[PDB]
Design a protein around this ligand. Structure first.
Ligand SMILES: Nc1ncnc2c1ncn2[C@@H]1O[C@H](COP(=O)(O)OP(=O)(O)OP(=O)(O)O)[C@@H](O)[C@H]1O
Ligand SMILES: [Ca+2]
Lengths: 358, 151
């Protein structure tokens, strides 16, 4: 009966506590007649202007966000909010005001019985079966490295990089344009996204991959809806390489996944350092490229001290880890007393989540 | 009169959100009142005072209480309140400053794993454990009350 809603920059994952997978996954957009939300706004980009209520993991416009929540409770889950506890997710370092606004919207507009807001990376860590470790969460609009001890993040050591899957799809369009074919229309961009999600992979050895792709003319065949075949070359492994070398898109101030994990760990108390290295948990859609966990493991092992053997945790269900951990956290007996009741909201106000949700 | 020890006995420890508490002079490090076993020693008090003057000391070394090392989780300022949150296994606590003093509170058992981690391993019906948020809130409400009084 408990609701778990993970609101991302690109996709919303909604379901019930206890389930092993989110029952409803739909784009986090709002379409306005030049009002519609979700898959239907996606399918109707001819009479509609599209807006993203969440940018880089942070809610930007709250009217469309309330529309997303309305479509989630009534049009997707097909449920009444007053009859169900809702566990919501937030990005690390979420501004205090934003938490207050989502709390007030949940407790007043939806008159929810109880509510809890948890950090997404922390939920992923719960999904991995531990409460201490470092989570690398890479989705569509933002990437975070979050060290966590006993279920509590270390905010001073968190790193945020505003680059993820959308930037990767744009870079794939750019580096596929060099074959003479442009990808500017809606359907062409859909093809590029499909190629990124289906054909792209992380090179275990980038230079060896370049050599083997140049000397053997290795090209994969992507079948188009009309039956024509598109040949994709080295771009397949040049697009996700951006995650390891952000300077490929001029993002020199972004260190890349291995150095991101390294610097986040090195900002922590060394007494926990080893435990952080032994539990590097990957989550999010942009961590699903083939060979990404193994490559990250090799690089972080090359960076770590000699007496430390890092371990990367990356289950095949990374993309929904945040949701799964949520559905796990709302299922634990300890968490039953951690819900913020409506009485506490009527007493202390929307600021109560600053004390109860940390 | 409302003694300092009564605050430790009834308002802090007596709330059930902590088993040890201490009100300590901010500058002189004197023991205004203390209760329980997890009360910082004088050398541990000086470390906490240095931690309140430089939060990077908490991030790199945490705080020591009763000979036990606690990891620092989060620091900052809640208005007139400087706060430090720490944790060690199933235990932890908070430090909240007032005008001329600070309060140190400790809950739980540091030699034990957290109840959430145990539930993650095997979710079993058990007794209610201390919510770390409730410990923070109780000390924050107290500390805010002394600041209103001027202490
Ligand atoms: N198998 C895959 N391989 C590579 N990328 C993928 C794969 N599946 C999804 N993606 C990409 O991952 C992104 C979606 O991931 P996710 O659902 O974790 O993001 P989000 O929660 O919407 O965003 P954020 O965490 O940035 O706020 C999209 O850019 C999508 O194209
Ligand atoms: Ca996300």
């Amino acid at each position: 009966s408990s609701i778990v809603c993970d609101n991302g920059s690109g996709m919303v994952k909604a379901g019930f506590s206890g389930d092993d997978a989110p029952r409803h996954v739909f784009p986090s957009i709002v379409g306005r007649p030049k009002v519609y939300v979700g898959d239907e706004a996606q399918s109707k980009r001819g009479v509609l202007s599209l807006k993203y209520p969440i940018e880089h993991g942070i809610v930007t416009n709250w009217d469309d966000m309330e529309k997303i929540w309305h479509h989630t409770f009534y049009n997707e889950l097909r449920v009444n909010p007053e009859q169900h506890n809702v566990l919501l997710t937030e990005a690390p370092m979420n501004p205090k005001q934003n938490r207050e606004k989502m709390t007030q919207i949940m407790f007043e507009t939806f008159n929810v019985p109880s509510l809890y807001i948890g950090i997404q990376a922390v939920l992923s860590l719960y999904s991995s079966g531990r409460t201490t470790g470092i989570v690398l969460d890479a989705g569509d609009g933002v990437t975070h490295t979050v060290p966590i001890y006993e279920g509590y993040s270390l905010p001073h050591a968190v790193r945020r990089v505003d680059m993820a899957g959308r930037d990767l799809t744009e870079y794939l369009m750019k580096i596929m344009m060099e074959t003479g074919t442009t990808f500017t229309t809606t359907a062409e961009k859909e093809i590029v996204r499909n190629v990124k999600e289906q054909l792209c992979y992380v090179a275990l050895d980038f230079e060896e991959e370049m050599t083997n792709s140049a000397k053997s003319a290795n090209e994969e065949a992507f079948e188009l809806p009309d039956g024509n075949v598109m040949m994709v070359g080295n771009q397949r492994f040049r697009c996700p390489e951006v995650l390891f070398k952000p300077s490929l898109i001029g993002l020199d101030e972004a260190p890349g996944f291995p150095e991101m994990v390294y610097q986040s760990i090195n900002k922590c108390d060394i007494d926990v350092r080893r435990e952080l290295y032994g539990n590097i948990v990957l989550s999010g859609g942009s961590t699903m490229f083939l060979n990404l966990p193994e490559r990250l493991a090799k690089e972080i092992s090359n960076l770590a001290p000699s007496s430390i053997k890092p371990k990367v945790v990356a289950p095949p269900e990374r993309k929904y880890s945040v949701w799964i951990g949520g559905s796990i956290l709302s299922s634990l007996t300890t968490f039953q007393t951690m819900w913020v009741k409506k009485s506490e909201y009527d007493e202390s106000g929307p600021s109560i989540v600053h004390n109860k949700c940390f | 009169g409302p003694s300092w020890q009564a605050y430790v006995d009834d308002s802090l420890i007596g709330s059930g959100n902590m088993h040890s508490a201490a009100i300590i002079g901010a500058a002189d490090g004197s023991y205004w009142a203390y209760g329980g076993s997890y009360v910082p020693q004088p050398e541990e008090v000086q470390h906490i005072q240095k931690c309140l003057s430089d939060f990077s000391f908490v991030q790199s070394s945490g705080v020591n209480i009763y000979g036990v090392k606690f990891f620092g989780l989060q620091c900052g300022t809640d208005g007139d309140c400087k706060y430090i949150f720490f944790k060690k296994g199933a235990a932890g606590g908070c430090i909240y400053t007032t005008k001329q003093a600070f309060i140190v509170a400790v809950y739980g058992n540091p030699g034990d794993t957290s109840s959430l981690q145990q539930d993650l391993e095997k979710n079993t019906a058990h007794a209610v454990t201390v919510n770390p948020a409730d410990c923070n809130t109780t000390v924050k409400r107290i500390a805010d009350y002394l600041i209103k009084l001027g202490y």
